[PDB]
Structures are given as structure tokens and as C-alpha cells.
UniProtKB/Swiss-Prot annotation, chain A:
Residues 2-173 form the VWFA domain. The chain holds residues 155 to 331 of 1170 of the full protein. The integrin I-domain (insert) is a VWFA domain. Integrins with I-domains do not undergo protease cleavage. The I-domain is necessary and sufficient for interaction with ICAM1 and F11R. It comes from Homo sapiens (Human). Heterodimer of an alpha and a beta subunit. The ITGAL alpha subunit associates with the ITGB2 beta subunit. Interacts with THBD. Interacts with CD226. In resting T-cells, up to 40% of surface ITGAL is constitutively phosphorylated. Phosphorylation causes conformational changes needed for ligand binding and is necessary for activation by some physiological agents. The gene is ITGAL. Integrin ITGAL/ITGB2 is a receptor for ICAM1, ICAM2, ICAM3 and ICAM4. Integrin ITGAL/ITGB2 is a receptor for F11R. Integrin ITGAL/ITGB2 is a receptor for the secreted form of ubiquitin-like protein ISG15; the interaction is mediated by ITGAL. Involved in a variety of immune phenomena including leukocyte-endothelial cell interaction, cytotoxic T-cell mediated killing, and antibody dependent killing by granulocytes and monocytes. Contributes to natural killer cell cytotoxicity. Involved in leukocyte adhesion and transmigration of leukocytes including T-cells and neutrophils. Belongs to the integrin alpha chain family. Glycans are attached at residue 34. This is Integrin alpha-L. Leukocytes. It comes from the Eukaryota. It is found in: Cell membrane.
Swiss-Prot record, chain B:
Glycans are attached at residues 103, 118, 156, 175. It is found in: Membrane. It comes from the Eukaryota. A motif (Cell attachment site) lies at residues 125-127. Monoubiquitinated, which is promoted by MARCH9 and leads to endocytosis. It comes from Homo sapiens. ICAM proteins are ligands for the leukocyte adhesion protein LFA-1 (integrin alpha-L/beta-2). During leukocyte trans-endothelial migration, ICAM1 engagement promotes the assembly of endothelial apical cups through ARHGEF26/SGEF and RHOG activation. (Microbial infection) Acts as a receptor for major receptor group rhinovirus A-B capsid proteins. Belongs to the immunoglobulin superfamily. ICAM family. Homodimer. Interacts with MUC1 and promotes cell aggregation in epithelial cells. Interacts with ARHGEF26/SGEF. Interacts (on T cell side) with CD81, CD247 and CD9 at immunological synapses between antigen-presenting cells and T cells. Residues 14-76, 101-166 form the Ig-like C2-type domain. This is Intercellular adhesion molecule 1. Disulfide bonds join 21-65, 25-69, 108-159. Induction: Up-regulated by coagulation factor Xa (F10) in atrial tissues. Up-regulated in atrial tissues by rapid pacing resembling atrial fibrillation.
Length: 177, 184
């Protein structure tokens, strides 16, 4: 399974929440450093960039060697165009993805979009969005957390505005792994 | 083609501000503000103009009004400045009595205060300026070795802070410190 972390590097997150997010990335990643488990990372704001590709990923396996030059951008939050980046310029076999493997998508964002796009370009990918802010409250405004939802209201969107409020998602995130 | 106002602001912690994310488009597909601060939107009247209320701002924040216009998404940035009077300005305790002709040290420390490029500190034996220097670090270390001669016979030394927001319509925010009962 070629899983991907898509974290929110927009201004709207407290300068701390950025690092609390990473901790979570590691809560699943390094905890599940077991073989046959590939990952990636794309920080989205007003623009996009692949923090660490697969190529440099399975070279020095550890979430403290792949976040060497991370710089908190803190601009907007192009949530849609972010998902459409993991699709087109991320999961490309060229970088370092295995065909006979399931492409997962771990989106991390307060659930506040700065644009209205469409993810049909990758509607097949295993989505996994995790809230973290304060904005994720009323339905009148906050509803896009349902937009990238897949299966019925279960453990897709909960109170976890701090995904730290959850143990090791190894045997838990393996829903088809 | 975005825009926002006010472009600059100076305010105390917990204070609140209003911001108008405006825009000039035939028909914009989206308008919003980008901040870590608590947002609360205002009136419904209008279409290409939106007002909010950034509340409980403690750090110098900088909101960002965006807009997805057909032409494209643009951005208008405002700057929120927070200013505040320090926790304590008190100076370091020495005992009341002292031998004349002693190159003793007067140390004063201030903890907090912003904007820090406007906050100055001054040690002084009464209404006489002994040393005016800008608050450095946390707490702000400041020192001047005072002597004991003629103006020293039973004096009162003290430490004050002066935060000048006068260059921007506010007042001079200063705080005096507990006196130094020197005897001899
Ligand atoms: C309060 O802070 C500002 C910032 O240092 C002081 O000076 C100006 O600062 C801006 C950047 O914020 C610089 O670009 C300017 O060159 C500075 N102008 C000056 C000082 O000539 C401002 O003067 C400070 N107020 C006081 C008097 O303490
Ligand atoms: C430092 O000085 C400021 C003003 O220069 C003080 O602000 C006032 O503090 C008093 C309490 O002593 C309050 O009752 C006032 O309401 C404050 N001003 C306002 C908003 O009217 C500040 O308290 C001083 N700092 C300390 C440590 O007392
Ligand atoms: C006494 O004051 C003089 C004034 O410059 C200073 O040079 C000297 O170091 C002081 N004495 C101490 C604390 O060593
Ligand atoms: C000395 O300090 C006391 C204590 O606050 C103060 O009341 C007085 O005005 C000061 N002046 C002198 C030297 O008496
Ligand atoms: Mg954001």
C-alpha cells in the first residue's frame, strides 16, 4: 500500500499545530515502519510541494530525516488542488510507486477550503482527512469535511481536532491493508 | 484583484478587530479571510465585500484576505500589531545601608512589553536620567554601576519603562518600579 500524507501548511493553523500534526504523521508512519509500507508528504497552502518523495523516502527511513528542510509557508489552503496534486504529480510511477499496491490518501487540514475544486480526478483513492483547528464547528459554513468523505459517518470525521486523541493506527488503519 | 482594510492596526491582547475582505470582480467564485485568529462574520448585505471580526488576538497576527476570481485567486494582507505593558519592571534588591565610595551595581529587569522595538528602559536616582536603553531579552537585563558620594546620603533609586506609541496616536505607556531606599 502506497500511502500518502497530505498536511495543511496554511496560516490558519496555530504555529504550534503544525508540529502537533507532524507528531501524528509519526504516530502512524514510524510506528508502522514495517516493510511493504510506503509513504509520502505534501504540505498544501496556496501552493504545493512534495516534502519527501518515495525515492528519498525508502533511503533513510525515519520521519526526522525526511523533514530536513520543512519551512512553514502559512498562506492559504487550496484543499482541492492539493488532492489533485497527490493524483497527477505524486503517485506517478516515475517517482517511486509500486503498481500492485493500494494508494492511500491521508489529508490533514482544519477543514477550511480557500477554493472550490473537484477531486473526481482521483475519486478512487483511499481518503483520510483529519481535522485540527477551531473552524471545524457549524454546518452553515463547515461542511467540506464531508466533501472528501468515503464510507458512512463512522471513524472518518470525529471530534479529533487533535488526532493525538487516538492510539497507534496500525491495526486500526488497516481497513484493507 | 483583492483588497482589504484596515491595512495596518495596533491593538492590545484579547482585543478584537473588524476586517473587510473586499474585491473587484464581475462575479467572484469565492471570498474569505485566512487567519489562526477566531473568526466571526458580519452582515449579509453586499456581495463582493465581506466583514469579519478577529477576536482575542494575543500575538502580532497578519490576516490574509483571498478571492477566487474567474481571472484568478488573489490576496490582500493586513497586519495586526499587539502592544502591552510588562509583567514586572522591578529592580534587583540590595540592602538599605551602604559604605560611601562603593562602585555598587544597579540592576533592573523588565519582563514582557510589546511592541519591543518601541519599549525603552531607564534606571534613575530620582527624576534624573541614569541610563535609557531598549528592552533586550526576557527579562530585560539592564545595569549601571552607581557610586556613593554627595547626591548619595539617603536617596531613592528606581526603574521605569517607556513604551512610545505616540508616533501612532496612542499614549506613552510607562510603568514605575518599587523604589530603592538607599541610606548613608
Ligand atoms: C516602533 O517600532 C518600529 C519598528 O522597528 C520603529 O521603527 C521603524 O520600524 C520599521 C519596521 O517596523 C522600519 O522599517 C523603519 O525603518 C523604522 N523607522 C524609524 C524608527 O525611523 C518605530 O520608530 C518604533 N517606535 C519607537 C519610536 O520606538
Ligand atoms: C502599567 O501601566 C499601565 C498603564 O500605563 C497600567 O494599566 C492600567 O492598570 C490599572 C491597574 O493598576 C488598571 O486599573 C487600568 O484599567 C489599566 N489601564 C486601563 C486599560 O485603563 C498597568 O496596570 C501597569 N502594569 C501593572 C503591573 O500594574
Ligand atoms: C566600576 O565602575 C566602572 C565604570 O566604568 C567599571 O569599569 C568597573 O568595572 C566597575 N567595577 C566593577 C563592578 O568591576
Ligand atoms: C524615598 O522612598 C519613599 C518610599 O516610597 C518615598 O515615599 C519618598 O518620597 C522617597 N524620598 C525620600 C528620599 O524621602
Ligand atoms: Mg487555512
Amino acid at each position: 500500500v502506497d500511502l500518502v500524507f497530505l498536511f495543511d501548511g496554511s496560516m490558519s493553523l496555530q504555529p504550534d499545530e503544525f508540529q502537533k500534526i507532524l507528531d501524528f504523521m509519526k504516530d502512524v508512519m514510524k510506528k508502522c515502519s514495517n516493510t511493504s509500507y510506503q509513504f509520502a508528504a505534501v504540505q498544501f497552502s496556496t501552493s504545493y510541494k512534495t516534502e519527501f518523495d518515495f525515492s528519498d523516502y525508502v533511503k533513510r527511513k525515519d520521519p526526522d530525516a525526511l523533514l530536513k528542510h520543512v519551512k512553514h509557508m502559512l498562506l492559504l489552503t487550496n484543499t482541492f488542488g492539493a488532492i489533485n496534486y497527490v493524483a497527477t504529480e505524486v503517485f506517478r510511477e516515475e517517482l517511486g510507486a509500486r503498481p500492485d499496491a493500494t494508494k492511500v490518501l491521508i489529508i490533514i487540514t482544519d477543514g477550511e477550503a480557500t477554493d472550490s475544486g473537484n477531486i473526481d480526478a482521483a475519486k478512487d483513492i483511499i481518503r483520510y482527512i483529519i481535522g485540527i483547528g477551531k473552524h471545524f464547528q457549524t454546518k452553515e459554513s463547515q461542511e467540506t469535511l464531508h466533501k472528501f468523505a468515503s464510507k458512512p459517518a463512522s471513524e472518518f470525521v470525529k471530534i479529533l481536532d487533535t488526532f493525538e486523541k487516538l492510539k497507534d493506527l496500525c491495526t486500526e488503519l488497516q481497513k484493507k491493508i | 484583484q483583492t483588497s482589504v482594510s484596515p491595512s495596518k492596526v495596533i491593538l492590545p491582547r484579547g482585543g478584537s478587530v473588524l476586517v473587510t475582505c473586499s474585491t473587484s470582480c464581475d462575479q467572484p467564485k469565492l471570498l474569505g479571510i485566512e487567519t489562526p485568529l477566531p473568526k466571526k462574520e458580519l452582515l449579509l448585505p453586499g456581495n463582493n465585500r465581506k466583514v469579519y471580526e478577529l477576536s482575542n488576538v494575543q500575538e502580532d497576527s497578519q490576516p490574509m484576505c483571498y478571492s477566487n476570481c474567474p481571472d484568478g485567486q488573489s490576496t490582500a494582507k493586513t497586519f495586526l500589531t499587539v502592544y502591552w505593558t510588562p509583567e514586572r519592571v522591578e529592580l534587583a534588591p540590595l540592602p538599605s545601608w551602604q559604605p560611601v565610595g562603593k562602585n555598587l551595581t544597579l540592576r533592573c529587569q523588565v519582563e514582557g512589553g510589546a511592541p519591543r522595538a518601541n519599549l525603552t528602559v531607564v534606571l534613575l536616582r530620582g527624576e534624573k536620567e541614569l541610563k535609557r536603553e531598549p528592552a533586550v531579552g526576557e527579562p530585560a537585563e539592564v545595569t549601571t554601576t552607581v557610586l556613593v558620594r554627595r547626591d548619595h546620603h539617603g536617596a531613592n533609586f528606581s526603574c521605569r519603562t517607556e513604551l512610545d506609541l505616540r508616533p501612532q496616536g496612542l499614549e506613552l505607556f510607562e510603568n514605575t518600579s518599587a523604589p530603592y531606599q538607599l541610606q548613608t
